[PDB]
From a paper:
The RBD is responsible for interacting with mammalian receptor angiotensin-converting enzyme 2 (ACE2) to mediate the viral infection of host cells. We first solved the crystal structures of the BD-503 Fab in complex with the RBD, RBD-S477N, RBD-E484K, RBD-N501Y and RBD-501Y.V2. BD-503 belongs to the VH3-53/3-66 public antibody class, and showed a similar binding mode to those of other antibodies in the same germline-based public antibody class. The binding sites of these antibodies to the RBD would completely overlap those of ACE2 and block SARS-CoV-2 receptor binding, thus preventing viral infection.
However, the natural K417N, E484K and N501Y mutations changed the binding sites of BD-503. The naturally occurring N501Y mutation disrupted interactions of RBD N501 to S28 and Y92 in the light chain of BD-503, and also caused a slight shift to break the contact of RBD G502 to Q27, G496 to Y92 and Y449 to S30 in that chain of BD-503. These changes may account for the reduced interaction affinities of BD-503 to RBD-E484K, RBD-N501Y and RBD-501Y.V2. Besides, the E484K, F486I and N501Y also showed decreased affinities to some antibodies, and BD-503 has a ten-fold reduction in affinity when binding to RBD-N501Y, lower than RBD-501Y.V2, and has a five-fold reduction binding to RBD-E484K. Among the mutations, the N501Y mutant, firstly identified in the UK,2 was the most abundant, followed by S477N, N439K, L452R, E484K, K417N.
Author numbering:
A (entry chain R): 334 to 526
B (entry chain L): 1 to 214
C (entry chain H): 1 to 132, 138 to 219
The structure:
C-alpha cells in the first residue's frame, strides 16, 4: 500500500477553515514528486524541507490538514502570519516543517446564488495556538454582560459565511488548501519514500 | 482591493420626499455593506448593517437593499433631520474597510442665479506687497457654480481659492467667494481684472470686472 | 451608555509626536476589532490602524511605520502613538468599534490633530469696499494662524445678509477668510459699516470701517 493522498487532495467535499479536517498518514509509502510534478497547484511552499528531497526522507507520521479559504487569505497559511484566518481559524507554528499546497477551487466550491456552506470564525477573544481547532458556536461576548445565546448588541454569532459564486475578482474566489506536516519522533518511522 | 462608488454626488429633496441613494462596489461583495449618516462636525452614525438590517434606534423610514455589486438606501418620507451626507462602507475585507465617497442631500428650492460682485484689492494690502482680488457669488441655488478669473483676458489657473457657505438657514441658498492672489508687481502690469461666473440660473455667463486704478 | 471618549489632539510641529486616547465604556476593547479612522478637512472617512481582539495590528500604507496602536486592559483604553507627523496627518481622528458584518456601530467623538510649521499670527483685516438696489461690502481677514477667527458687523447690530465664509489654507500655511454683507445702496453714504474681527489664539481684536473708495 501507498499513501492515500488522492482521498485528501481529490476528495469531494472540503471542510470549512474553522473546522479544518485532519488526516493521519501511517504505514505507507508516499511519492511526493508526483504532487509537485502535477503543475496543477497555485501555491506549493515547503518549510524546513525541500520538496525534491522529500521522497528520500522518512517520518514517523505525516498529517494532512485540508480546508477552503479565500484567495487573498492563502498569504496567512504561513509561519508568522497574522489576520483573521491565521489568528482565529488555522495557525502554523513559527518552526513549521512541511508544505502548504493551495489551488483554485472556483470551479467546484462556488455556485450561483451563493455557496454558503463554507464558514470562518470572525470573532475570537484571543489568538489560536498552533494546530488548535476551535469549533464552539457560542454567541461571542464583545461586552461585559453575557449573551445567553441571543444575538444582539455586543452579542455576535462567531462564524460568518464566504458566499462563493463562480463569478468573482481574483483573491475573493475559493481556494482549497492542504497543509502537510512532517513529524519525526523517537518512534518507528512509518512513512517513507 | 475594493473601491466603492456613490450614484449622485449630491441630490436635492423636499421634506416628505422618497429618496434613493445608490452605492456600487468594484467587485461582488455579497451583502457585506453598511450605510452611514454624517452631519457637519459630528461623528458618523450607523444606519443599515448587512445591506438591509435596520440598526437599533434608527427610524424605520430608513431601509437598505442589494447584494453583489449594487446597493440602495431609501428614506421613505424625508424628515427635516435627514438633510446630511450619507456614506456606504463595505465589510467584506474586515477589518480593513473602505468607505464610499459620500452623497450629500440638501434642501430643494427653486433655482436662483447668483449676484456677482468683484472687489479690487485695497490699497492697504497693496502696501504690504500682495494683491487679493475677490469674487462673491451671493444667494444662489443649486450649489453647482463655476468661477473663472481672466486677467487682461488671459484665463487664470493655479492662483485662486474658493470657499462656499453651508446652505442658508432661511434662504436655502449658497454663497461662494473666490480669491485671486497676485503679487503687487504682477498685479500692476495688467489692466482688466474680470470674474466670469456660469450657473444654471443664468441665461449665459455673467462677467463683473474692473480696470486697475479707475 | 456605551461611549468612546477621545482625547489628546492638538497642534504639533511636523516631525513631532502625539498620543491619542480612547476610553471605552459599555464594550470591552480587549474583545473587539478596535479601529482608528480619520477624516481630513472636506474629505471623507479614511481607515488608519486596527487592533484585533487577539492582539494583531494592521496599519494604513501611509502611516505604516510611524504610528502604533495599542491598549491598556486595566483602563479599558485604546491608544494611538503618532510619531513623525506630517502636514497631511491633519484630520479629525475617530476611534470606533468595528463589528464587521454588524457594522461600525460605536464611534468616538472626534479629536482634531493639526500638524503645521506655521507661527501663530493675528490677521490683517482689509476692506472689501462697495462699488457704484443692493450693494455688497465686506472684510478680507488674511494670513492668521491657527484657527479659528470670528467676525461680526456693527457689534452684532447687523446680521441680515451677512455671509462669513469658511477659511481656506493658503500655500503659505496661513488661513484666510472673508465676510461679506448686502445692504441697501442708499445707505452707503449714511450708514457706518464696521467689521469686528476676533482671533483669540493671538489675542488680536480688530475693528475695520468699510467705506466707499475715493
Amino acid at each position: 500500500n501507498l499513501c492515500p493522498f488522492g482521498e485528501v487532495f481529490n476528495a469531494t467535499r472540503f471542510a470549512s477553515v474553522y473546522a479544518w479536517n485532519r488526516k493521519r498518514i501511517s504505514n505507507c509509502v508516499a511519492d511526493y514528486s508526483v504532487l509537485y510534478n502535477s503543475a496543477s497547484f497555485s501555491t506549493f511552499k515547503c518549510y524546513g524541507v525541500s520538496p525534491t528531497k522529500l521522497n528520500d526522507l522518512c517520518f514517523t507520521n505525516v498529517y494532512a490538514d485540508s480546508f477552503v479559504i479565500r484567495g487573498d487569505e492563502v498569504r496567512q497559511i504561513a509561519p508568522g502570519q497574522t489576520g483573521k484566518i491565521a489568528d482565529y481559524n488555522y495557525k502554523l507554528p513559527d518552526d513549521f516543517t512541511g508544505c502548504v499546497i493551495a489551488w483554485n477551487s472556483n470551479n467546484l466550491d462556488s455556485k450561483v446564488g451563493g455557496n454558503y456552506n463554507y464558514l470562518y470564525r470572525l470573532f475570537r477573544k484571543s489568538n489560536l495556538k498552533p494546530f488548535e481547532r476551535d469549533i464552539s458556536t457560542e454567541i461571542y461576548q464583545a461586552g461585559s454582560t453575557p449573551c445567553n445565546g441571543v444575538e444582539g448588541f455586543n452579542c455576535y454569532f462567531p462564524l460568518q459565511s464566504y458566499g462563493f459564486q463562480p463569478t468573482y475578482g481574483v483573491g475573493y474566489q475559493p481556494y482549497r488548501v492542504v497543509v502537510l506536516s512532517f513529524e519525526l519522533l523517537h518512534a518507528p518511522a512509518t512513512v517513507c519514500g | 482591493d475594493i473601491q466603492m462608488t456613490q450614484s449622485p454626488s449630491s441630490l436635492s429633496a423636499s421634506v416628505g420626499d422618497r429618496v434613493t441613494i445608490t452605492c456600487r462596489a468594484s467587485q461582488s461583495i455579497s451583502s457585506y455593506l453598511n450605510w452611514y449618516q454624517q452631519k457637519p462636525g459630528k461623528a458618523p452614525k450607523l444606519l443599515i448593517y448587512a445591506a438591509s438590517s435596520l440598526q437599533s434606534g434608527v427610524p424605520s423610514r430608513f431601509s437598505g437593499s442589494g447584494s453583489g455589486t449594487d446597493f440602495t438606501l431609501t428614506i421613505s418620507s424625508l424628515q427635516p433631520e435627514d438633510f446630511a451626507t450619507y456614506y456606504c462602507q463595505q465589510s467584506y475585507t474586515t477589518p480593513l474597510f473602505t468607505f464610499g465617497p459620500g452623497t450629500k442631500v440638501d434642501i430643494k428650492r427653486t433655482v436662483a442665479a447668483p449676484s456677482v460682485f468683484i472687489f479690487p484689492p485695497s490699497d492697504e494690502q497693496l502696501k504690504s506687497g500682495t494683491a487679493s482680488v475677490v469674487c462673491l457669488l451671493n444667494n444662489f441655488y443649486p450649489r453647482e457654480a463655476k468661477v473663472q478669473w481672466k486677467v487682461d483676458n488671459a484665463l487664470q489657473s493655479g492662483n485662486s481659492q474658493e470657499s462656499v457657505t453651508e446652505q442658508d438657514s432661511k434662504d436655502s441658498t449658497y454663497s461662494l467667494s473666490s480669491t485671486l492672489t497676485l503679487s503687487k508687481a504682477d498685479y500692476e502690469k495688467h489692466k482688466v481684472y474680470a470674474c466670469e461666473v456660469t450657473h444654471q440660473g443664468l441665461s449665459s455667463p455673467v462677467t463683473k470686472s474692473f480696470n486697475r486704478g479707475e | 451608555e456605551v461611549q468612546l471618549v477621545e482625547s489628546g489632539g492638538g497642534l504639533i510641529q511636523p516631525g513631532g509626536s502625539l498620543r491619542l486616547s480612547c476610553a471605552a465604556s459599555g464594550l470591552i476593547v480587549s474583545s473587539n476589532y478596535m479601529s482608528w479612522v480619520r477624516q481630513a478637512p472636506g474629505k471623507g472617512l479614511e481607515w488608519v490602524s486596527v487592533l484585533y481582539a487577539g492582539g494583531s495590528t494592521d496599519y494604513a500604507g501611509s502611516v505604516k511605520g510611524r504610528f502604533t496602536i495599542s491598549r491598556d486592559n486595566s483602563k479599558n483604553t485604546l491608544y494611538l502613538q503618532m510619531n513623525s507627523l506630517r502636514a497631511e496627518d491633519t484630520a479629525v481622528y475617530y476611534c470606533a468599534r468595528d463589528a464587521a458584518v454588524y457594522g461600525i456601530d460605536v464611534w468616538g467623538q472626534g479629536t482634531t490633530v493639526t500638524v503645521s510649521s506655521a507661527s501663530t499670527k493675528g490677521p490683517s483685516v482689509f476692506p472689501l469696499a462697495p462699488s457704484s438696489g443692493t450693494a455688497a461690502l465686506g472684510c478680507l481677514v488674511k494670513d492668521y494662524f491657527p484657527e479659528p477667527v470670528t467676525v461680526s458687523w456693527n457689534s452684532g447690530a447687523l446680521t441680515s445678509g451677512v455671509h462669513t465664509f469658511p477659511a481656506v489654507l493658503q500655500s503659505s500655511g496661513l488661513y484666510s477668510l472673508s465676510s461679506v454683507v448686502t445692504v441697501p445702496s442708499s445707505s452707503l453714504g449714511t450708514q457706518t459699516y464696521i467689521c469686528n474681527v476676533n482671533h483669540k489664539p493671538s489675542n488680536t481684536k480688530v475693528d475695520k470701517k468699510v467705506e466707499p473708495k475715493s
